[PDB]
């Protein structure tokens with residue numbers, strides 16, 4: 001399929017085994033901001049569901065399907081690829097909704113649906129929006145969408161901003177410096193220090209932070225899911241140009257995202273910004289191996305380039321330069337192996 | 343090979359990607375008990391290394407090979423299957439030991455050694471000794487061992503003992519009762535409560551604990567690595583008959599292990615017992631889903647059966663009965679997906 005061609009089999013097994021656990025389902029459902037915002041987006045746009053056909057892409061436990069049912073959908077096809085499908089079917093029976101929710105086991109790239117749908121709903125966002133590459137399956141499912149059909153969420157904004165955090169930089173550098181030791185039980189490890197720093201700094205840091213550390217207005221990159229094709233997400237180029245508001249060492253870039261549910265009645269936002277209440281996505285920070293010194297008024301420019309890989313993630317390349325001084329930094333991150341610092 | 347026949351490819355790639363990170367190697371090297379005990383066993387038995395040929399099975403960073411070099415080995419073949427082999431080669435060059443340490447990339451079941459060896463060294467122990475099934479590779483490598491050659495470690499003892507921990511047992515139903523909720527955002531989850539309890543009890547708990555919880559002298563199961571064949575580890579039957587020293591509810595069984603390095607000069611032990619200082623292996627506990635009441639002086643009897651699976655672990659079946667009352671309990675656990683509670 002379109003799914004097995006872009007996905008190493010090893011990565012798919014680990015991925016669907018992880019989402020087959022009820023404990024993981026629980027962890028996600030207990031995020032009140034996530035769950036409540038989805039429910040609000042769906043129930044406040046009830047006209048977009050009432051007597052319509054809906055597709056739920058990666059239904060999980062089946063919670064979004066239940067919300068579409070609460071809003072008055074005629075029928076909901078809830079497609080799910082893990083063994084979680086069997087547990088969803090149990091819930092559909094015990095909440096007396098077999099007349100309205102049909103669980104279809106399989107990947108959305110491989111199953112067959114009896115009709116076209118009026119609207120597609122999903123929670124495809126990962127860390128930094130793009131991790132897990134579930135946006136591709138969400139976009140692929142537009143093949144079942146009637147003309148003039150809607151998608152929930154409808155748009156996604158990735159936000160990035162430069163940050164200063166000496167203590168985070170020093171935690172990571174200190175761990176790597178284990179490999180400086182000229183005589184670890186009589187053995188010199190120091191020839192691996194370079195490799196060790198690379199490995200530590202390749203890992204993005206997932207946790208929250210005070211907005212006081214951000215040193216510029218954020219830059220926005222927008223994906224419109226109604227218009228995007230699957231292929232737009234194999235290579236994502238995000239140019240940026242920050243105007244620094246504070247002088248200091250810039251230790252890397254912080255990422256967060258917003259999605260919007262653009263209904264007929266109203267638009268609802270789900271934000272993972274650090275100014276907003278916390279979600280289980282936190283925020284994500286990509287440290288530079290060497291910090292860059294920038295004076296207030298200076299311009300920090302460059303590119304964030306995400307290239308999709310077969311382990312359902314992205315290789316991230318960030319190249320940044322201070323324009324006034326020509327101080328440059330280049331960094332490669334591996335979004336599959338993040339560091340959960342919370 | 344003998345390795346790809348017993349191992350799902352998906353599990354092997356996750357396994358060797360995990361051991362290819364320097365950070366994981368560092369985490370194991372920073373365990374002073376582990377590293378120090380290996381060094382002590384090797385240097386204090388210098389006669390078993392001086393001018394001998396040695397094979398290091400799963401060398402990692404190569405630290406055991408460097409210890410065999412410190413002890414006077416003529417030649418050391420260090421076999422390593424992850425991308426860590428390339429980092430080991432760098433260390434061998436930068437510590438000027440290319441004349442004495444030869445790194446061989448690949449699995450020990452598939453590579454070729456030029457000669458037979460006097461002694462084999464490895465750290466094959468996982469959680470509960472047997473997890474990761476690396477003992478099979480260690481035993482397989484006896485094909486390169488000269489007659490009357492030694493192995494380090496030489497013997498392994500698994501210890502089991504019944505324990506009481508009401509708070510651990512209760513935490514499982516607390517987590518599961520998230521599902522016993524008739525209207526979670528308008529949805530009744532309660533029908534999944536049973537499945538959630540089952541899922542929590544299939545997971546062994548990895549962490550440490552006060553010895554005050556143990557309710558009987560432990561029982562020992564011994565593997566002699568000089569005599570054992572690969573096939574002895576596919577199915578491991580551990581009968582037990584505990585004489586209870588304390589009355590109370592028995593909530594499950596605790597496991598830990600000891601290995602011995604039996605050299606010519608002295609025997610050195612590496613213990614992960616809860617009476618001993620903590621190691622990165624902690625201890626492991628398998629809850630019974632129904633706890634058993636035992637009076638001091640009563641006999642708790644039964645079987646612990648470990649059955650090897652193709653995900654490089656074991657399915658664990660525990661059946662226990664109190665002989666005086668006829669109260670029975672069984673559990674099935676999946677040692678691949680443990681719960682890290684520490």
Ligand SMILES: N=C(N)NCCCCN(CCCN)C[C@H]1O[C@@H](n2cnc3c(N)ncnc32)[C@H](O)[C@@H]1O
Nearest residue numbers: 019058059060079080081082107108123125126137
């Ligand atoms: N903490 C984080 N990262 N939170 C954000 C991630 C949460 C994503 N979650 C959706 C939950 C719905 N509310 C994923 C679920 O979608 C299923 N799924 C994945 N890919 C699929 C495919 N190609 N076809 C059909 N189903 C597919 C998967 O099995 C799993 O059940």
Ligand SMILES: N=C(N)NCCCCN(CCCN)C[C@H]1O[C@@H](n2cnc3c(N)ncnc32)[C@H](O)[C@@H]1O
Nearest residue numbers: 361400401402421422423424449450465467468479
């Ligand atoms: N709690 C924990 N960590 N418990 C487990 C202790 C882990 C010990 N570690 C050795 C490094 C320290 N001496 C494992 C290493 O053995 C390598 N390896 C495994 N199987 C291999 C095979 N069939 N052929 C060749 N190499 C093989 C693996 O790649 C990895 O480097």
